[PDB]
Design a protein around this ligand. Structure first.
Ligand SMILES: Nc1nc2c(ncn2[C@@H]2O[C@H](COP(=O)(O)OP(=O)(O)O)[C@@H](O)[C@H]2O)c(=O)[nH]1
Ligand SMILES: [K+]
Ligand SMILES: [K+]
Ligand SMILES: [K+]
Ligand SMILES: [Mg+2]
Length: 152
């Protein structure tokens, strides 16, 4: 698949679980894989699987974001809807402000519709509409991939 979509985010936001829900090729996931979702044919990257080589935590999360800004056509910025906006999320956001490329914000661990309102805190990151998802329950994936593919 021609467009490249990269998932970026701090640890424990659900990146590998979403990669495995979406990816064709079966660390916790294959890192780089073809993917197909209906009419969408693309390559997917879980940048959280890229070992940066003995660097501090914050440097590793910023460097994963930088690799996405280099490699990808569209970035999925993933955050944890049960934890709010953390400083580490703010640090990833500050890196992603440097790109012109489309960033779609995905708020994961929203395990049923009653949790949707947890998205409103994440408008503060400055990437527009947060998309609620659950990788374990398989929720919101079509809506997320439609927003990503709008950019193709
Ligand atoms: N409640 C909940 N837990 C999830 C969800 N997605 C992932 N998890 C769990 O959160 C943990 C971290 O998930 P993982 O995909 O490895 O996150 P990563 O560190 O961002 O790659 C694991 O225990 C997952 O099973 C979700 O949608 N809801
Ligand atoms: K529900
Ligand atoms: K769906
Ligand atoms: K384009
Ligand atoms: Mg992972």
């Amino acid at each position: 698949g021609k467009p490249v979509v990269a998932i970026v985010g701090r640890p424990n936001v659900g990146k590998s679980t979403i990669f495995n829900r979406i990816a064709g090729e079966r660390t916790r996931d294959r890192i780089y894989s073809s993917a197909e979702w209906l009419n969408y044919d693309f390559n997917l990257i879980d940048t959280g699987g890229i070992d940066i080589g003995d660097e501090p935590f914050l440097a590793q999360i910023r460097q994963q974001a930088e690799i996405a800004m280099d490699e990808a056509d569209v970035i999925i910025f993933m955050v944890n809807g049960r934890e709010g906006v953390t400083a580490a999320d703010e640090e990833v956001a500050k890196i992603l402000y440097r790109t012109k490329k489309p960033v779609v914000l995905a708020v994961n661990k929203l395990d049923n519709t009653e949790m949707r309102a947890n998205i409103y805190d994440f408008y503060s990151l400055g990437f527009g509409e947060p998309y609620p998802i659950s990788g374990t329950h398989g929720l919101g994936l079509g809506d997320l991939l439609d927003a990503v593919a709008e950019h193709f």
